[PDB]
Every structure is written in structure tokens, then in C-alpha cells.
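Researcher: Please generate the 3D structure of the following complex. Treat every line as part of one assembly.
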Amino acid sequence: SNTTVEAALQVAHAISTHIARPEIDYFVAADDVPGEHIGESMFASACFY
Amino acid sequence: MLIEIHMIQNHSPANLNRDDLGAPKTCYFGGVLRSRISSQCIKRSIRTSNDFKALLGGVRTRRLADLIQQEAGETECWKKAQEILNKCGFKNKDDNTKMLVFMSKDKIKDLARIVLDNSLGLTEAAQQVANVIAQATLAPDIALCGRMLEPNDKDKDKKVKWSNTTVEAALQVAHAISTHIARPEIDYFVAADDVPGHIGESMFASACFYKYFSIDWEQLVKNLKGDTNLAAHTVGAFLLAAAKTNPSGKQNSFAAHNYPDGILVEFKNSPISYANAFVRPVSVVKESDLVEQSIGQLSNYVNDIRLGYYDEQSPVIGFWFSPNNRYPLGYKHSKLASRNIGNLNELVGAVLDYIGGFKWEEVQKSK
Amino acid sequence: MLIEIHMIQNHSPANLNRDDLGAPKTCYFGGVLRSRISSQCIKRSIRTSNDFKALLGGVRTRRLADLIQQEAGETECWKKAQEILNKCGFKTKMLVFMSKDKIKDLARIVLDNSLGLTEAAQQVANVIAQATLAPDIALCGRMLEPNDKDKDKKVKWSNTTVEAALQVAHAISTHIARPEIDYFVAADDVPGEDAGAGHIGESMFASACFYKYFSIDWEQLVKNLKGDTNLAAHTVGAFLLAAAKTNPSGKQNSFAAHNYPDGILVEFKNSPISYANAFVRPVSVVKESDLVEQSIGQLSNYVNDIRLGYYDEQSPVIGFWFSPNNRYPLGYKHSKLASRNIGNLNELVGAVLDYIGGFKWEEVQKS
Amino acid sequence: MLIEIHMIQNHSPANLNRDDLGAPKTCYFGGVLRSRISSQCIKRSIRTSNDFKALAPDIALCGRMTVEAALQVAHAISTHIARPEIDYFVAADDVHIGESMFASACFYKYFSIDWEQLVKNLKGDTNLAAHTVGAFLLAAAKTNPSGKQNSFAAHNYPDGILVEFKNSPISYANAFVRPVSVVKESDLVEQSIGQLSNYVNDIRLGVIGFWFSPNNRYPLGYKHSKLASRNIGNLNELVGAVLDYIGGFKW
Amino acid sequence: NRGTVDFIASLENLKEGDLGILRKLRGARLDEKLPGFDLFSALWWPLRQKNQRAPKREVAWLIAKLFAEFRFEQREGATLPILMGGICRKLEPKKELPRVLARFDQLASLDIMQMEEPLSVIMGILRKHQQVCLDWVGLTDVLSFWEQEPVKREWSDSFIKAYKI
Amino acid sequence: SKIKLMSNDRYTFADRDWYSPLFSYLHAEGNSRQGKLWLVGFASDKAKSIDIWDKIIELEGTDTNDELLAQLANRATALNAMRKKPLRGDFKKSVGTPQIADIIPHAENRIAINAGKMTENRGYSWQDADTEYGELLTKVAYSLEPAQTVDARLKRGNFISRKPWPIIP
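Model: Done. Output below.
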């Protein structure tokens, strides 16, 4: 039979009010045993509508 | 008399029109890629709009039998109606019922009455149905878009003659194109599962579009059997719908409900398109924005065209509309538009007064 | 003398001329693929335009019997018309091109007379042969060939050849061709089980910048229209205006490509020269400039090379360059190739008429 | 002596010569099919023309009925592969699909004139022969066959002419055994002229000549080579130089 | 050819941040954004110094952007006209095959500055069918000399040979 | 003889028509006999002369096949049918691929060398003579489809496989 329900809610993608500034964080995991690998992550901050 | 509407509208990230692969439609203009919206989508959005609810009456479908049966209510009548329609000439090649029929919605009762006649046989009923269909062209949507219908000569009964089923269109719509270089983008999505117990891809884009509509007053009046009030109401409702309606595709995910930032309405005897204002793509600078630069280039091209070609013994009259005079026209001219209007309602009133003199309420009371 | 017209025109995405398969026409130039608009399409579009209706005094049709019948209130003159035309030699029916008033009046008076069939056919043939007084006939020529296999042996034909006074070349793109395909799906108004995956259609469209070439011989145009001279000037002016502001009516209800030319060059020579070789190397778009500017620059370079090449002091040539409001100059850096750069179309028409003779456009608009 | 003229000319899409079936004339060369313009079309195109109408001349150059004409015209050949095309047309009624053939190609043309025969046919006159040579050069430079010109206004002008005074007759068709393939950094006419240049760069290594291009648009030799004795940017100056070399006559 | 192998090797040595920087520069030119210009210069200029037959700037920029977006694994003998052409044997001949074939064939009427989006859709079609390997060096070599007829002829012939199997 | 100077709707100029007076001769008068057959043909039309040609065929006299000889005696129709096929589509009053008529005479001249073996079907056959058109059709296909795409290559492959078909009546 019919298995379709029309959506009653409309949402839009949250976009910024300014120019985005992506940033890179460099991380190095440590070791708890002495003895005888630079990492790269991304983050940003913004204002959303 | 030709009424021409030029619109500039900026949209949020969305997918209003997509191809068979799911990507936004694109075109090549001036040697560069632009985003595109098909004219059929705009026409369908305007036709199936709240502002066009009153001026409807045309139906385009492959399922005339269902409507004919629903009109009566308890007669069965499905098989007999289907046989009559097959005898009429609606091609059934490849076992697919097709050849979409477009006609007025008030003539379905006549078809149901004619089909339910026991005195007549089948060929006479088919001829009567064809005659009824060929003379149902009295709706504003049909008068605007037009209609073509060519039944095939292979499955129809040989004793069936068709009259003229063609009505010339009174509306011309061009494909929407972007004023800059298109930048399609990919979105990566995942469908999660609630019970604890891969990656997809979609396409979207954002662009600023230039839209062009043209309406012939004489042809629209002629199609509606000389009803001038109905034509004025149709023009007003079309302006309202084109201003305040957007295509409905992927809107539940992208709520792109933006309104035009500039509308120019002109009256002239010949059609002129201002698309050549954007052969050079718009490049954004740090001291301005996209809409202002697009409007500036449009104003420059309009001034050049007005001072180059349109200057004849016949004058040209146009009005310019921006919301609360937010975006003025060319700063170096300040005289291209004979009137600057800050509201849509007074713009519609001005057009209706210019056509032949019409009040909004009086033409609203025509349907 | 010879009047030479060169145009550069950029069009929006559309399909103006299409082949049997429903695709835009193409050709090979310089070893690469270019878009093409046929010459007969342009001639037909100019002939049936609003700026030429004052000189449209010829009809090309095979249904002459209907036209002869329409020149009668109640008299039955259809079967006899077909019989007379069959004895003439028009036995598929042959297309006949000639003036309207002559065929109407003379065919009505001769056909309705009580005379022999052979004599009536001979008089009809003579009237058809001698009816070569119309600007369109003079511009496009005529070639009538009666069928000697199934014509009455008693009748004899006279000269029916009119040498043309206009030469039109196929429009070719200044760059490489980029054909595009748009996919459409037709919707149904009434909900239901619907079809399967859907019938996806295909529509082919393209956008290109075309170079157009026209050549008019004034002496042959005068000779075709007999010793009359003002009519020739009116025809030249109307042809220039129509070619400036008319486009073919292809898929214009969905592709409103009503763009206007950006550059026109009118030269007065004694021998024909074509500037097509300016675009043997295709135009490539860079981050600076646009397509039209590069095309006009290449055209100016080729014109300068030709002028500084084949040059005779005993027959110098002059011309006028027209751009809307002087927005696209020819000699961008230093060269003054043109003599009387004009920024208005009507001023250009007036200058052309003045050079042809002591002609004012107002005075010649009476023949 | 013998005067040999080589011309390179590009034509817009047209049909200047067709056969009984309506298709453009063709030939076979270099293992491929090439477009062809008949010799008896270029002749009777240069002849019987209004421009050329400038001891009866026009018979010494081209004889009629033992006149022993002094002009030799070869068959025009293409420098690339033939690309015939079909146009589909219909006729309206304002009250059946047909097909036509057309093509576009770049042609190499060869003409030869025998000076001694021209002088003997004119009964010793030498200024009239020089005037006839100049008139023929001007007419051949500015004339095209009158084919389907009303539908294909192909009135292009030659992009390169070479005049030579060799001891024996020889044509440079062997410079076009390999069909020209268009590259992005060049065009068809430039590549054809370069191929011609790399056929007189040889031969001499393993006579004099005058080269003419409109305003020096296309120079012979893609270097600072002296393969051409003189490079001239005007047609009248080329005629004057040839007139001077013929023995010092003034145009 | 040496010069392209080392370029692809250097591209394969990049990390997530540089890949994202190149990803955000898709559809853009080399000059407008400075970080992308600096990264491309650092990756490319020594190769142009050492080797004269190195790929041109435009082709290298296009290949870098495509690799940043798609990140295929380099493997010799896995060129585009083979994978596309082996894929085309599983579609419906009447409808889907012409639609894919037109998109594959449109590449012959575009220059190197307009070959981003069609290649993007082709590589998306590849990714939709679980493809993990591609020959980047061969693609760069073909794109370098795209204005030569024998190159296109070999491209189409390879496509047909892969398809007819 | 049925030779003409032009190619009309019902004729295609190829070469001397040496295959016409073969079914009649080898079945009514002359029959099979080892020797050299001399053929003299003189085309005419009312009071106008067109052309005369002659030929010599080496015959061994090894039986005859009625169907194959009848097919050989009717080959101008097959060549005309091959020529009249358009490049694409079906149009009324269409001349059809004029480039094929430019290459037909050379193939006919090449085929005519083995006339004696083709007449008696010793080692030469219709399919054997069909091979001579392959190289010429391949050369023509490049001119007809000058594109570097897959569709052009497929169209060339389809075009290469054209050959005349024997029609007995």
C-alpha cells in the first residue's frame, strides 16, 4: 500500500555570516615508557544563521 | 504590445533542478560554465502556485478514464471509457498509455455524459469525444503555455476526423543562467542506525540567476475570446507568482526561499534580452557584493541598448522595483527607469493602469 | 556598386536551426567543429519579419487553387483551377513563387472566362511568367521549371528566370562548438500508480558567437525592379533594419534567445570580400576580456591586414562601424579603420541611404 | 623562360564544383581522399571575368581552336583530408526532407606561364605581354568560381603566393603527402605554409623567388632564413617586382 | 616519463591538511588564493628546475585538485578508458549506456581549462562502482598532449577494446 | 551493352559490363568450351553512339551453375543498390553516398582480372571479389566520419561492412 508521509518541517543548511578561516592543529602522541608521527587535524570557528 | 520582465535573484545553497545523475543542471555561456534552471520547472512552479489558484482550469494527464469514472460515481465505466479513448487515437505503442491530454477541467462532465450514451455506438462516441476535446481551450494556463496534440493514425478508427487542436503560446520563458562561474560542491552523507547491535555523495550549488519572461497581450486576449478582464487578472497573477514562487525540489533539505532583489518591467513592441550583460562573468571584489555588481552591469547594458537600438519614433516605458529601494539602478544614469517603485503591489497597479486601465479588485472579481 | 554587411552576434543557449535528428547544425572550419545557422533560415526569418511586411509582395506556395478560389464569393472555381494548372505543367505539386495581386486578379478573370482549356492554360502561364515585380522576388531570385512529361504539348513557356541580387553565407561560430543535452521528464497532474522509472527525454541545445555576412548588388536590384529607384532604397533600408533586429523562430518558447548584435560593419566596394578567414584559428577565452571583444579584435586585425594588402589607389573603399553606444570599438589600440563610427542604428541607415544617393528614409517610405 | 605561381587559399564552407550526383569533386593523394577543384573551372573563372577585361590578347594567354596557349593551369588539391558534410533542408508553404552536400578545405594552386610563347603569340610585342602577365596575376588573385555562391558566399582571398623562375617545371604537391593535422598553438594555413617552407628548405640543399603575404601576415620560413629572395606585403608591389625581373617594365 | 612519477609521488606524500587546502580551492584559479599558490610552488618548482619535460602548471594544478578531491591509489595499467568501458558493460543498452557515453565523449570538445567538471562527474561515476585504483601518471601524460589527434584516437581505441571484451 | 556517361536513378557507372552476355551465351549458343572468349560491346541510344569496348576471357569449360551465373549476369543492380543506400536514415529520391561511386570503378577494374575464374567458380567467388572493397571503404570512412570519438569509430566499423548483395531476378 502507500507508505509515503509528506514532511511538515523544512530545514536549511547553517551558513556563516563572514569568511571562513580553516585552521590546522599539529598533535604528537606521547609514550609512557622511555626508549629509542607529527599528526594533522582541522578546526574552525564561525557565526551561524 | 509586449510585456517583458527581467529579474535578478540570489539563492542559498540548494539543488532546485537536477539531471538523471543527480547533479545540478549546467550550461556553457560566454565560454564559461554557469548554473542553469530549466524553463519547464519555472513554468510548472508558476502554474502550480497559490497566487495562480484562481486562474486555473487546465489539466494535463494520461488518466482521463479515472476522472471520467470519478465524475459519475457509480457506473463502473472504466473499460468503456478506455476503449473509446483508444479508438480516439491516443497511441498505445509499447503497451504504454501515453500522449498526455491537456484540456479544460469543466469539460469532463460533457465527456462523462457522452460516454454514458447508450443510443450511440463506439465510433460516434469517439468522434464526439474528439470534438469535445478539440474545443476545450478556454483556461488561462492553456492560453499562456499553449497546447499541441497529434494523435497517431495507426490505432485510431479510420472513421475518426480531428479538427485543429493547436493554440499558439502567449508566454515565452528563457532558461535561468548564472551571472558568475558555477562552483558545484559535493556533500558527504551517512545514514545512521539507532539500534547499536557507507559514505554517500550528493551535489549542491549556490548562484545568482537572471530570469527573463515575455508576454504578448494581443495573443493572450485573442486566446481568451476577447475577455480583457481575465487577461489582466492573468497578467497580475502571473507577476505575483513569478515574484513569490520558487521551484520545489530538495526544499526539505535546502530551505532556499529567497526573494528577488530587482525586477524590471518594460513595455515594447519587440522582444529584447539582456543576457549579453553577463558574457563577461562577474568577479567579486572586496569593496562590493555579487548583487550590486550584477545590477551595475545590467544597468550598463540597458543604457547601451536604449541609446543604441530602442531610440526610434516609438518610445519605451519601464519601471524598476527593488525592496524598499535597497538596490538602485545605474548610479551614472539615474534616468533609465521612468519610475522606481518600492513595493510589488504598486508595481502591479502601475502595469494594470498602463495596459488599458484596470483596478486590482475589479479584475480579481473576474474568476 | 556592392553593399557588404558583416555582423558579430552572441546568442543565449538555444536551438534555432536543427537537423532531421533534432540537433543543432554543425560544420567543419579550420579543421575544427563550429556551430552553423543555415542561409535559407535567415532569409526566411528576414522575409517574414515585421520590418519587411511593407515590401512582402510575393507568395511561394503549391496551393494556388485555394488562392484562386478565395478570389470569388460563391462561384465554384476549384476543380477547373486544378485542371488548368495540371495542363500548365504543375503536376506531389510544384512550388510556385510570384506576386499576390497579379495571381489573384488575373487568374480570377482568366479562369472564370468561358474559353478553351488550352488557351486558358497558355494565358495563365504567360501571367505567371510575367509576374516578377516584388522586392522579395528580386532579392531571392526565382527558378521555375515546368514538367514537360505531363504537360499539354500545345502550350509554350517563356523566360521565368530572375537572377538574385542578395548573397547570404552560412553563419559560423568564432570558436569551437560545445553541444549540450538537457534531460526532461513530463509530470502528471492526477496522482496514482504512475509509470515506472520514468521516460527521460533528450533535447539538444548550444550557445555560440556567430559571424554573419551579407552582400547586396545595387545595379541588379534596380534592374530587377525596373527603372524604379526609390523602391530599391526602401528595400535596402528595410532589409538592413530587419537583419539587425530579427532572429529565427526555433525553440523560442523555451529558449528566448532574443539577443541583439554587438558589432556591425557596412562597406561599399566593387568586388566581394569575406572576412571569415579571421576565425580560422578558434577564439579561446582567457581570464581577461570576453568572447565578443576577442572576436571583434581578430576581425579588426584581419580587416587591417586585408586593407594594407590588396589595395588600389584607383578604387578606395569606405565603410561605417556601428556598436551600441560605442561600447565595442574596432581599432582598440590605435587604428582608425572605419571612417564614420556611428552609435545609432537609424543614423547608420540614414548614412547608408545618403551614400547610395540623395535619399531620405522618410521620403522613400512611400513605395 | 617559365614563370611559376604557387597559391595557398582557404575557403569557407561552400560548394564551388560538384559532379553529376551533386557532391563536391574529390581526388586521391597520400593514401587519403582530398578535395579537388577542376582546372577547367579555375580557367573560365579567371577567363570570361569582368576584372580580367583590362594582336588580340586573351587568346595568346589561353588559346582557342594550333594557337598553342602559353598558360597552364593544374588541378587544385587539398592539403588535408576531405570532410564532406550533408545539410538537411525543407521547403515551407506560407499558406519532405532533402539533402545537399557541401565542404570546406584549404587548396594549393599551381599556374605556369611560358614567356617565349607569349611573346611569339603577340608577334614580337613585349610590353603587351608584360601587361597581360600583370593582368592575369591580378585576376587570378581576386577571382573565385561562381558555384553555389548565392547560398555559400565564399569570397575569401589567398593567404600566400610564391612566384618562381625555375629552369624546369615542377610542382610542390609532394610537400602535402602527409595530411596537415591542426594543433592548438597554430592554425591550418600557418601549418600548410610551414610544410611548403620545409620543401624548399630542402631541394636547394640536396633559382630565385618572390613571396607575398597580406601585410606580411604569414612569412615564408619559420625562422630568419633566406629561402625567399624578397618578401612583399602588397600585391601591386609583387606585380612590379615580377615586371622588373621580366626585363624591366613599369606597371 | 621522469618528472610526472615524482610529481605523483610527492602528491601521494601529502597529509590531511594540505589535501583539505587543495579541496577548498576546487573550481578556482592558481593566482587568487595565496596558500594554494605557495603549496603548489613548493611541490612543483624544484621539479621544473631539475627536469625540463615536467608537466605544465595548468595540468599539474588540475591533477592536484582532482587527486585532493578523489584520492585514488596509483597503479599502472588502470587508465580511465579501461575502467570506464568495463563499467559500461553492466548498464541497460537502450537508455543508460548512451547517457554515460555522451558524458565520456564530451571531453573531446574542451580545453585543459574546462576539463574539471566532466572529469569530476566521470570520477564520481567510478567511485559509485567501488573503484580504488587509477593511473595518475598516464592520465597526466594524456592530458599534457590533449591537442593531438593520435592521442584521442588511442584513447577511444582503448575504450572500445576494453568495452568489447 | 548498358554503359552510359552519367549516373541516373537507375544506373551507376562502374566499368565495362562484361558479365551481361554470359548467362545467355553459356546456356544457349557456345556453351562450355576451352579457349579464349572475345567480347565486343557497342553501346548506343537511338541514333547516338556512346562507347565501344572489347575483352578477352580465358575459359576452361568446367560445367556451369544456373543460380550463380544468373546472379553474375545481374550485378549492375547490386552495385546500384549498394550506392543508393544513404549514410543514415531513409529518404525518398536520395542519391546516396556519392563517395562510393568514386571508388566503385577501381574495385571493378581490379575484380575484372580474374574474370575467367569468377565465371566458372574455380577459385574465385562473389565473396572473394567482395574483399577488394575493404581498403577503399576504410579510406572513405575516415573522410565520412572525421571524429576521434567512440561513436565515430563504431559508425566507421558499421560502414566498413558494406558489400553488394546478389539478386537473381
